[PDB]
Amino acid sequence: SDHKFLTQAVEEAYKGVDCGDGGPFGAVIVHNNEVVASCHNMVLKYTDPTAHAEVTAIREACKKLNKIELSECEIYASCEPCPMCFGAIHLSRLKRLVYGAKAEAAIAIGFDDFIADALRGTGVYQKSSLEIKKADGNGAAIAEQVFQNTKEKFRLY
Amino acid sequence: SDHKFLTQAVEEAYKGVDCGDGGPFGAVIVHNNEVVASCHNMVLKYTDPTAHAEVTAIREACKKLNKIELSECEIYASCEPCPMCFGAIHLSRLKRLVYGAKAEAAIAIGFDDFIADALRGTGVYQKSSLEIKKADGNGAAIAEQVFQNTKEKFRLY
Numbered sequence A, B: 001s002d003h004k005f006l007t008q009a010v011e012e013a014y015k016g017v018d019c020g021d022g023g024p025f026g027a028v029i030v031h032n033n034e035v036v037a038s039c040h041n042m043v044l045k046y047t048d049p050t051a052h053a054e055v056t057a058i059r060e061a062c063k064k065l066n067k068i069e070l071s072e073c074e075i076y077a078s079c080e081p082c083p084m085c086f087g088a089i090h091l092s093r094l095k096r097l098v099y100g101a102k103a104e105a106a107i108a109i110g111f112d113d114f115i116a117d118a119l120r121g122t123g124v125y126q127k128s129s130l131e132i133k134k135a136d137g138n139g140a141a142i143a144e145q146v147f148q149n150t151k152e153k154f155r156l157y
């Protein structure tokens, strides 16, 4: 089922960058095969630099479930969560994170080299509680190609 | 000027605890001596674990200035911002952060050992360039006293 929800997050990234809500980033929060929230980056729509896909999904899932913790839930991110979003994932008590593309795939088309030390295990103070799965194979390929596809779409604009 | 806005952030922390909005944390965003946002933790009121004082303040300042970057603004946090909030401060491009109490003051009364490497200078993948001032003297005194005064008066999260 990992493939299904990761590809749904990828679809959310495409949808969000097509409708102009924000950058090509998606996030899906699931509760035992049940989709709780399916969101993308809403920074431009909300005029909110904290409205990344992961943060938006956390907010919507927490409001839908009437609780500030998502201990029974897992999050699927189309792209490797940033430091802010990884911190939000920690605070949300999500029990597992699956992300598709490395941050370098986003950096390749002009996004900031804003990478979470706690996700990559390079910190002194911050460590991760979280089970972190980096996607491989076909899901990883789809997620990685997201960014070059979006650049192609808007090339002649 | 630093002491005034840090004191206002401390006051926001106290007000938020008294309201039941969240924990004893405040944040004030300033543009050239004008207060752009004055917020406290809203986790309990919004059912939103991302609604820390700093994130709430960034949201409100961005909505008031109707822009997603706060390049000429400064932020005053009653307590050392967590990894999430420091990532949000990074993304909002705030040029200066003044914080009152070290994170250990909050950790000592039950909060997560959840510390931002990039703030303390131990980040590797997260490279922050904003100016960071840790309060001294009376500011540090009142900011630390926040956590002694608010013990047992709010629900942890």
Ligand SMILES: O=c1[nH]c(=O)c2ncn([C@@H]3O[C@H](CO)[C@@H](O)[C@H]3O)c2[nH]1
Pocket (backbone or CB within 6 Å): A091, B023, B025, B026, B040, B041, B051, B052, B053, B054, B079, B080, B081, B082, B085, B103, B106, B107, B111, B112, B113, B114
């Ligand atoms: O930056 C923060 N803003 C808050 O509102 C807040 N509320 C609680 N905490 C927790 O306090 C500790 C010290 O930063 C960390 O465990 C935070 O998650 C907060 N950190």
Ligand SMILES: [Zn+2]
Pocket (backbone or CB within 6 Å): A052, A053, A054, A081, A082, A083, A084, A085, A086
């Ligand atoms: Zn993010």
Ligand SMILES: [Zn+2]
Pocket (backbone or CB within 6 Å): B052, B053, B054, B081, B082, B083, B084, B085, B086
């Ligand atoms: Zn925080």
